[PDB]
A paper describes a structure:
In the nucleus of the infected cell, influenza polymerase (FluPol) uses the viral genomic RNA (vRNA) as template to perform synthesis of either capped and polyadenylated viral mRNA (transcription), or unmodified anti-genomic copies (complementary or cRNA), which then serve as the template for vRNA synthesis (replication). ANP32 is required for both vRNA to cRNA and cRNA to vRNA replication. ANP32 comprises a folded, N-terminal leucine-rich repeat (LRR) domain followed by a Glu-, Asp-rich intrinsically disordered region known as the low complexity acidic region (LCAR). First, it stabilises the formation of the replication complex, an asymmetric FluPol dimer comprising a replicase, which is part of a parental RNP and synthesises the genome copy and an encapsidase, a newly synthesised apo-FluPol, which binds the 5’ end of the nascent RNA replicate to nucleate formation of a progeny RNP.
Cryo-EM grids made after mixing apo-FluPolB and hANP32A show a majority of dimers with a 2-fold symmetric interface, which are quite distinct from those of FluPolA. Several different pseudo-symmetric dimer structures were determined at 2.8 to 3.1 Å overall resolution, almost invariably comprising an encapsidase paired with a variable partner. The dimers have a 2-fold symmetrical interface, although the peripheral domains of each monomer can be in quite different conformations. The apo-FluPolB dimer interface involves the PA-arch residues 375-385 of one monomer contacting PA/332-338 and 361-364 of the second monomer, and vice versa. In addition, the tips of the PB1 β-hairpin of each monomer (residues 360-363, closely associated with the PA-arch), interact with each other across the 2-fold axis. The core dimer interface buries only ~2200 Å2 of solvent accessible surface compared to ~3600 Å2 for the FluPolA symmetrical dimer. The apo-FluPolB dimer interface involves hydrophobic (e.g. PA/F335, Y361, W364, I375, M376, V379), polar and salt-bridge interactions (e.g. PA/D382 with Y361 and K338, E378 with K338 and K358). Even the core conformations vary due to different openings of the polymerase. We used the split luciferase assay to show that mutations in the symmetrical FluPolB dimer interface significantly reduce self-oligomerisation in cells, suggesting that this dimer likely exists under physiological conditions.
Numbering used by the authors:
A (entry chain C): 1 to 36, 43 to 83, 91 to 249
B (entry chain A): 199 to 716
C (entry chain E): 359 to 387
D (entry chain B): 1 to 31, 34 to 189, 201 to 643, 652 to 667, 681 to 752
E (entry chain D): 353 to 375
Amino acid sequence: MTLAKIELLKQLLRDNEAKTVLKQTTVDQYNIIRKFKNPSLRMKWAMCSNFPLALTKGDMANRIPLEYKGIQLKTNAQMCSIAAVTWWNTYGPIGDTEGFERVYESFFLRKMRLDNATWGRITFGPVERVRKRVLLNPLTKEMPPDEASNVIMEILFPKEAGIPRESTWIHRELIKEKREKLKGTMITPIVLAYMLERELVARRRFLPVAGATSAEFIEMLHCLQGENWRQIYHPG
Amino acid sequence: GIDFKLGQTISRLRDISVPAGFSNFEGMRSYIDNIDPKGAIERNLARMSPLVSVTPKKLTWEDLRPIGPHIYNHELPEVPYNAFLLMSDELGLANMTEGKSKKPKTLAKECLEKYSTLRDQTDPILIMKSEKANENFLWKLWRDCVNTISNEEMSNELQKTNYAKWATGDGLTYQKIMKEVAIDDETMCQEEPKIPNKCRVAAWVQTEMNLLSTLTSKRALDLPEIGPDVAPVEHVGSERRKYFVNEINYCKASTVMMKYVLFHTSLLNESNASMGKYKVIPITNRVVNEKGESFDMLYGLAVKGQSHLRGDTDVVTVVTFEFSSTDPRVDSGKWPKYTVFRIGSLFVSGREKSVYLYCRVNGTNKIQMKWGMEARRCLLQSMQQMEAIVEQESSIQGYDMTKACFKGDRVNSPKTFSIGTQEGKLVKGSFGKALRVIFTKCLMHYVFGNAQLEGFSAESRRLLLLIQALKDRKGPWVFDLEGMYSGIEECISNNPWVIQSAYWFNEWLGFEKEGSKV
Amino acid sequence: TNYAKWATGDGLTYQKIMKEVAIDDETMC
Amino acid sequence: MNINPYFLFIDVPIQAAISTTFPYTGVPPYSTGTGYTIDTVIRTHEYSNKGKQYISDVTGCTMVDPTNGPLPEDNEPSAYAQLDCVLEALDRMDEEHPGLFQAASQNAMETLMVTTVDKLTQGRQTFDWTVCRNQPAATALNTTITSFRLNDLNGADKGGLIPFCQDIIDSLDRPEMTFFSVKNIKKIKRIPMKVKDKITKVEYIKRALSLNTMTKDAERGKLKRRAIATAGIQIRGFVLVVENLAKNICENLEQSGLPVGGNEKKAKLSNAVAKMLSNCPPGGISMTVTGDNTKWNECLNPRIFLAMTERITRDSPIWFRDFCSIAPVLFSNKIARLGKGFMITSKTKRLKAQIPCPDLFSIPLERYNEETRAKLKKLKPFFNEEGTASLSPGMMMGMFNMLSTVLGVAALGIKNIGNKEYLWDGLQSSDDFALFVNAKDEETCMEGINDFYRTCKLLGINMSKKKSYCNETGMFEFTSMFYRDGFVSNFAMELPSFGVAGVNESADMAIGMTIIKNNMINNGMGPATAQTAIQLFIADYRYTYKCHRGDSKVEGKRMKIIKELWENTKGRDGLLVADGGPNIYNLRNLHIPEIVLKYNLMDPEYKGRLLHPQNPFVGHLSIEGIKEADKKMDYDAVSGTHSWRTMILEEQCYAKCCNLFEACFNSASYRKPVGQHSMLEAMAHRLRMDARLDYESGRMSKDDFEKAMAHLGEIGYI
Amino acid sequence: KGFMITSKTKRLKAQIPCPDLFS
Ligand SMILES: [Mg+2]
């Protein structure tokens, strides 16, 4: 990769524009650089187009023929058609699923709570509810956003970890558990980082609550509560 | 620290952006920092003129007056039928099908093959020509549509594309010229605005409202299934949805809404796909009756013009030919925009009825094309109100109240609503009838919606709330009633729904006045 | 050249259409 | 029998049946906007004709100052707001809230000192002066920074937003202004290129003060179209800071309906009405006034906002006061770009031509229609040669929403005039206000309402006598929500959300389902209504994405593949709706992604196919939208094949540089990089460190080490 | 060459061939 990295850098510097932008834009400004009306209509029009999807250059295109059963999929002008995605879901490369069993632990735990929960009666009388600050979803271990970001960096970015702060030792068990569970997968680190942020960063909102306040009930608040109806729900 | 310092241009802009009485921003700064007002509001109010005031005035039933009296004037013309497609006069050529889904072209071809007498009708009989619409152009376009649909090929483009350029009026378009020529030219003046005509009440809107809130043997609205329900709340929701859809599925408003939605889907898809060609678009629907049989219903044809849509509001011309059985000569004032032809006749159960072809040139745009694809939001609007009412009733009594509200329980009586009136005697109707009336009202808000309807509804909300407060003996006060009345009345110009809503509002206000004596 | 097209009146030339449309049109005299 | 829908109101309260009255099921009205902008300018200057008229020496424009002018003598809207009256109101509010202005100012300063220039990339379309058009926030920001680089302005690369704003202020002083302009060179083809253009100081200042105009599109409660204004980038930071300060001030105020949304506002309405009723004296009456301010954007003078900011920051560092007083001054001297001109046609010749804004008066006014003729006759004094209107007085809606709400609450806080026998208080939020007056008789309640009307007129607040009414407490409206006897009939506007919402399959599904859940939580959507909404959304999603059930006989390009998939996979309940699989979403599981919901039900082969770690459709560069969806909304999804994604030379160059930076720095994607050095130096250091680690770790041979070191030395970092 | 017809308001012209002189 380092040889590939240096070759790509040399090929990029060969252009005057790339040289000037690289030497002029500071690291702080990089954010702005990475940022270059009616989404419904635009998406609608894109759907019926010959190739709406923007397929990144790579070696996987060869796995899917340009045309399949007389249906165009991709062109060399890359651009791709939804038919390619449908074929991929029909026949195509078989990935490794063990990663999801640990990477997407929040959603799996949500599904387990939904499945193993027990329901009861429903009361239709007026319900007294109070505006309270509640956590929408359960957290494995809540921490402030800066500490959560540091923890995620220490988890899935072993490098760039010079001078560890006074937060890795506090959450050493979480760090080691996440490092062990997340190994053996190949998903892009951005998805893993966002999932870990969701797991760790607490999301709180001012909501109307009448009864249980724990995040297990708050998750199903849309079904448990009601302006003139109440439900009994025991999370799994 | 931080030493954010001002330059010269910004300082001078600050200097000349100071309220009256100050020469420099430093003066304003010092005045605000040091000066301590001690009741400047009282002094200013004391020296303020007495003519400036809310002029409050108590509101009573007598102050409330009919809105838009001119709608009762008989001099003004009767409101015409400006809806995009025929709603209560629609005729649907029906062919039974096993259920297989096919392309609109093939469906229309089969429907026309079933009715060969109308398909092969080549000699027309004009009944009325609106004002300008050339009967020859419209008939040639209709024949072109029929031939293009009935041709063996699978292309949906008209076979002429060169006569249709003039029949649809696309050719008769002004040509742009550079600004300098216009400046030098003297005859080029800015076009005057088109003020909407002022019209009176019409009897076709009331008949349409009556007819489109009635049960029919044909159910068109079908919705995707949802996952199995296991909690009590979702069971209750499913039950309420079951009652609601049982009531609304078999009403003609639902079929009209589905026809509108499907036609707009096809129109938008064609516009996205075909850009520089004239297209043939059937007005198709799928209809299932009580027995479970499924039918394809062809309600006519449409010619979609040169869809060169640059932006969203850019106009695309659509020439619609629609089958109907109503003779327009019975009510001429309702059809001044439609060039109709008498194309044939058919027997439904042995009774012959004629079939006219209403031809009309209209225009659409991406906003309207898409918002015609979201007419199910009318269904949701209907659902919300009945859900609220049922929730209130079930809040009164602990057990769920849906069954009694609709069919009647062993302890409670069915709920009924004041639905209409006859000979000045108001009449009652079941909850299902009120549900259908609400659905028809929402559908009409959709089909007849424009700036005038939005303005009228928004400005009559004030009157409705004032009347509600008056009913509750809250003694509402209005500071300027005539201004509100004028704002409401400035929107009653051309929209049939707005005029009929004004008439209904006046009728209901009179009934409330009469009943307020108790 | 664009200005001279309209200044000389050459731009105000009547368009030619097919005989079918013209005969189907009652306003052509 | 003749059906009359209004008869429903005989059996149901209007508030309960108010949802059906809204025409939010039809087509919202859509629009040249030059005429609307001209009416806006004429009306804004018409309410202030009696003020002081002078000439702006900085710009050469005609300025009108209604503030501290003659008091109104009639019932027309007036902008003649007395400064001392506003100061009295502010002093009373500050007395009622000890140390609120100081705390808000200090908090705003604290959050400003840590803000970076990148924050300006948020928001909506902004006016780009380099091209004099409307460009996204990031594009305009980077264009302005690049142009500043040519004119010796180096604040943006300094990091914080203070140096960037300082360089924006300095840019107003430079004798000239060099930048890059788009040149559509003819070659036939129209090739757009970059031209090193230069403009003079006055023209650049006019560009900076210019506010581009557009015709409103999403408004649905009015029969006529109005004009919205988009500002440039020279004011976005200052306006952002001032709005942050205003929000800090108005968060504590109980009378303020901002910043709150959803169910909090319903609770605020109920609490306010209950508190007012409880305070009602024994035997008195509490009258509630449903109010609606007339326009109210064209009577608020920016000079009043300048005074308000000056008073709010009475005890702040002078630098922060000056910084906070830059948005109001740049607003009082604003210029309005008057649309795209008119259109004149010759009917006898069948010709048409657009007359652009600069040449509006180049045509004798006899050639305009009567309405436009009068418009231009009145607009001539305030018309600039370049084709812009000098609009000093008034404001354009949407710029200062929090500050105007603070002013309204200041007006409400008076609570009395002349110690009369009545007390007034109410709610105010962004042009929408409701009032309550407690007295002993209805006569005194109306006297208090009249006094409030006069006081508001003294402050520049003009409430409509046509759009407002009064009744007894216990029934009123606020921000379209209707309160009646404790049952807040939250109006139903949830319609324009059920339908595919944009980016892609999984994201659209998550967004829609979270929307259903949020509507259920906040607006009280019922179970049956939510299920119907799910059904409609499923129908719209299946149609739009051409993904119907496999068993259905529908024909299409993707439908044949879905049909094959239907029987090619044994388990038919595990496929996503995107692939024609059955829908499992119900009321109970609207918070869980559908990929995980069917995870157990997917055949191992199918899940392996869909959930491949490497997918050409999914690009690392396309993950930016996984977290938030444009308002910024958060949705929970699962990476998969359905997570796909839908100037040229600059785009390629930037994109590639950013991709290489991301590849070298894997953390840049997740967290914002920080650094005041060029990207090249950091990239080179990272590559050198990686090469050294690979060589020392046995992953990289000596020859490759020599090659990489030679390359780095050639780059010039050894 | 038949005859020629023209509409001034629409600024259109057409040529009617000899056979179509009576149509
Ligand atoms: Mg209001």
